[PDB]
Amino acid sequence: ELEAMSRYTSPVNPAVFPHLTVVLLAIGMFFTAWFFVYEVTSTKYTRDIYKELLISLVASLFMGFGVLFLLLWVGIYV
Amino acid sequence: YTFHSTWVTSEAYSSPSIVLSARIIFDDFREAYYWLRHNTPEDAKVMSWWDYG
Amino acid sequence: PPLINEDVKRTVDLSSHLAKVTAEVVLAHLGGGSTSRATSFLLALEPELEARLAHLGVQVKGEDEEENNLEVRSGRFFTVKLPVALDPGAKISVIVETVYTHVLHPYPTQITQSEKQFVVFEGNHYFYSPYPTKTQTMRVKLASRNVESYTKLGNPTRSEDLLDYGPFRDVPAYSQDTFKVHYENNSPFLTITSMTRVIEVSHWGNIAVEENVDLKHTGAVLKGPFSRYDYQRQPDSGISSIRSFKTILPAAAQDVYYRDEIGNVSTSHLLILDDSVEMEIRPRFPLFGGWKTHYIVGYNLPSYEYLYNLGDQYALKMRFVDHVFDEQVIDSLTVKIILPEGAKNIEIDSPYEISRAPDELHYTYLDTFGRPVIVAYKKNLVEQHIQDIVVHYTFNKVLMLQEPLLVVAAFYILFFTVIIY
Amino acid sequence: LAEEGFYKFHNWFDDRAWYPLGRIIGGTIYPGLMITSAAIYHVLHFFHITIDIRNVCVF
Numbered sequence: 001e002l003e004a005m006s007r008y009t010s011p012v013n014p015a016v017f018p019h020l021t022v023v024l025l026a027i028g029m030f031f032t033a034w035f036f037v038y039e040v041t042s043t044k045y046t047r048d049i050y051k052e053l054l055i056s057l058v059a060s061l062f063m064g065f066g067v068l069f070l071l072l073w074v075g076i077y078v
Numbered sequence: 079y080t081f082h083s084t085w086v087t088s089e090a091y092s093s094p095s096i097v098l099s100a101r102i103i104f105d106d107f108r109e110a111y112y113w114l115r116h117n118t119p120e121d122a123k124v125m126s127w128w129d130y131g
Numbered sequence: 132p133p134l135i136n137e138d139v140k141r142t143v144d145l146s147s148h149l150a151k152v153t154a155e156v157v158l159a160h161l162g163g164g165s166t167s168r169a170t171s172f173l174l175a176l177e178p179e180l181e182a183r184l185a186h187l188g189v190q191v192k193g194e195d196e197e198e199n200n201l202e203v204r205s206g207r208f209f210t211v212k213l214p215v216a217l218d219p220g221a222k223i224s225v226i227v228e229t230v231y232t233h234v235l236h237p238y239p240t241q242i243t244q245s246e247k248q249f250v251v252f253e254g255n256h257y258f259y260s261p262y263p264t265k266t267q268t269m270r271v272k273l274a275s276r277n278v279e280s281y282t283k284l285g286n287p288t289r290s291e292d293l294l295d296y297g298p299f300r301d302v303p304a305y306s307q308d309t310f311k312v313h314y315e316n317n318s319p320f321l322t323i324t325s326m327t328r329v330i331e332v333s334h335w336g337n338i339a340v341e342e343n344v345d346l347k348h349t350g351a352v353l354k355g356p357f358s359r360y361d362y363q364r365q366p367d368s369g370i371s372s373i374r375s376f377k378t379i380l381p382a383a384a385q386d387v388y389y390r391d392e393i394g395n396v397s398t399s400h401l402l403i404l405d406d407s408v409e410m411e412i413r414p415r416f417p418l419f420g421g422w423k424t425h426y427i428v429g430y431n432l433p434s435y436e437y438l439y440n441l442g443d444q445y446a447l448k449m450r451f452v453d454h455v456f457d458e459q460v461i462d463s464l465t466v467k468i469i470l471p472e473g474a475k476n477i478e479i480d481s482p483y484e485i486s487r488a489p490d491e492l493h494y495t496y497l498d499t500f501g502r503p504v505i506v507a508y509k510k511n512l513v514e515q516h517i518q519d520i521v522v523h524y525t526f527n528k529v530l531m532l533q534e535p536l537l538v539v540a541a542f543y544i545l546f547f548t549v550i551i552y
Numbered sequence: 553l554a555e556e557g558f559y560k561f562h563n564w565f566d567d568r569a570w571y572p573l574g575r576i577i578g579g580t581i582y583p584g585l586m587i588t589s590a591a592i593y594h595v596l597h598f599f600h601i602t603i604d605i606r607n608v609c610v611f
């Protein structure tokens with residue numbers, strides 16, 4: 001029917017999208033900068049692949065959620 | 079230099095050509111063209127100075 | 132089962148461009164026995180106006196409404212099932228109400244800038260029906276007091292703007308007669324040629340609806356030169372012209388952008404009322420006659436007010452066609468409901484019959500496979516047609532996550548490529 | 553040039569300017585901006601960004 005169902009409260013209150021995006025984007029950007037810095041300042045002999053991979057993963061993760069939430073905040077609401 | 083550059087960009091070198099403004103907005107340059115696009119035969123020959131072609 | 136109409140106080144009124152007629156039928160049953168139950172009831176439309184009917188609804192005195200099935204048994208007679216069966220000798224006040232559209236034509240087709248668009252109607256004195264009626268007095272309400280020619284039957288008396296017709300005590304089974312009135316109706320003749328309503332649902336935030344509106348002024352196509360000077364310096368000038376119209380919004384619209392095909396339009400005034408959001412709209416140019424305009428109106432409203440979610444199954448009830456202006460009329464309407472990424476089962480409960488095409492897919496800013504869209508084509512929509520359409524769809528809760536992770540993977544692949552470089 | 557493939561724009565007779573004469577757009581304009589904007593729009597479409605052609609052409 002219709003009475004059994006109840007109002008669809010969103011999982012994330014929209015008023016929190018801007019701040020949530022900012023911090024996530026900031027963290028992601030910082031990680032990306034670190035990766036690029038590490039890439040620039042590293043000789044062939046000293047290039048730990050585990051470190052690179054882990055930093056890459058964390059950076060991409062944060063950047064992805066950041067961009068998504070930023071897009072959402074812009075009012076496209078994908 | 080940074081200040082003067084921002085001021086020049088803001089006050090003067092940024093003004094919409096088809097939106098004569100003084101906030102009051104004069105958007106005739108669009109209303110007339112829209113009228114033309116909707117209330118004329120599909121084969122008109124609107125003649126105007128080469129500026130607005 | 133023989134039925135007799137006792138009183139029919141039909142009152143066609145033509146103040147607007149819609150000829151909505153309401154007849155207060157009173158039905159009684161003959162003295163004949165063994166015909167105790169007469170659950171059904173019949174209605175008919177004139178052969179001239181049969182191909183013009185807008186929403187036709189029946190009623191019973193008090194708070195009630197009835198279902199009028201459409202069948203052929205020829206003027207597409209409507210079968211009405213009375214709520215309570217009536218035995219012989221009973222009486223049942225059936226307030227039949229109908230609305231005819233596009234039935235008012237301007238007799239002077241080409242008025243100049245300053246004339247009143249005289250129109251012309253072609254009605255029917257007697258109440259067309261399949262049962263012989265008793266006395267019936269059709270009262271006509273007009274717009275202005277400038278009648279030119281009205282059919283005289285039984286010496287119709289004239290009020291300030293109301294024409295009363297004498298009671299026709301007896302009529303035959305299929306009594307038909309035509310009358311025409313040539314009055315002055317300088318009212319907004321506005322017909323929406325087409326309207327496309329797009330409703331995009333998003334489980335994250337809100338639901339955004341945008342509608343493209345082509346609208347055209349119908350009566351009294353303008354002839355001769357148009358002069359802005361006369362339009363400004365004279366109030367009498369341009370009586371038939373429509374400077375602006377007001378569109379009632381649903382009281383939750385947050386950011387409403389009125390924009391034409393060419394660009395954002397400066398002129399529009401929206402006021403947030405207690406129960407609604409009013410929005411006066413001026414087109415780019417004052418329409419006179421045969422001057423068509425095309426605009427776009429779109430607002431996004433919070434989802435919590437509408438979307439209903441029970442476990443895994445959601446429901447969305449919304450307005451099929453939203454209000455546009457007072458006494459509107461649509462000639463072509465296509466509703467598209469763009470559901471989210473996953474809508475496994477999409478059942479739709481329509482209040483009335485809607486022609487429906489097959490579903491297709493839409494590709495938004497982050498969809499990787501697409502999202503289902505529901506398309507419904509209808510014609511001849513009026514103000515009364517506004518109803519509530521509900522769709523039931525099952526959307527897996529975790530599926531919404533499926534979008535952000537892909538955005539992460541692409542980023543990660545680029546990082547991996549750099550590592551390879 | 554976006555909706556219709558490049559090959560349908562290199563040669564293109566526009567009969568909506570200089571009415572009696574008609575000017576050729578295919579071989580009278582430097583096709584640089586149109587092929588940097590069409591390409592920047594096609595890449596976004598391939599990545600399902602689905603931006604408008606009046607919004608990747610202003611920015």
Ligand SMILES: *[C@@H]1O[C@H](CO)[C@@H](O[C@@H]2O[C@H](CO)[C@@H](O[C@@H]3O[C@H](CO[C@H]4O[C@H](CO[C@H]5O[C@H](CO)[C@@H](O)[C@H](O)[C@@H]5O)[C@@H](O)[C@H](O[C@H]5O[C@H](CO)[C@@H](O)[C@H](O)[C@@H]5O)[C@@H]4O)[C@@H](O)[C@H](O[C@H]4O[C@H](CO)[C@@H](O)[C@H](O)[C@@H]4O)[C@@H]3O)[C@H](O)[C@H]2NC(C)=O)[C@H](O)[C@H]1NC(C)=O
Binds near residue numbers: 103400411
């Ligand atoms: C892109 O396009 C969008 C959309 O077009 C555009 O956004 C619009 O921008 C305009 C700015 O020009 C916004 O206009 C505002 O409208 C407000 C609403 O006005 C209505 O309500 C007024 C209040 O009336 C109440 O009180 C009176 C008694 O005082 C009472 O009788 C009423 O019943 C009601 O209770 C009302 O006065 C007003 O009436 C206007 O229209 C009538 C004609 O019907 C005219 O006779 C009046 O003189 C009057 O003009 C209307 O009904 C309004 O409050 C607001 O006013 C502020 O600004 C003005 C100066 O412009 C000040 O004088 C005033 O004190 C306020 O500070 C303003 O006019 C409009 O709302 C936007 N619409 C949308 C959808 O966003 C963008 O600008 C475009 N983009 C760009 C870049 O241009």
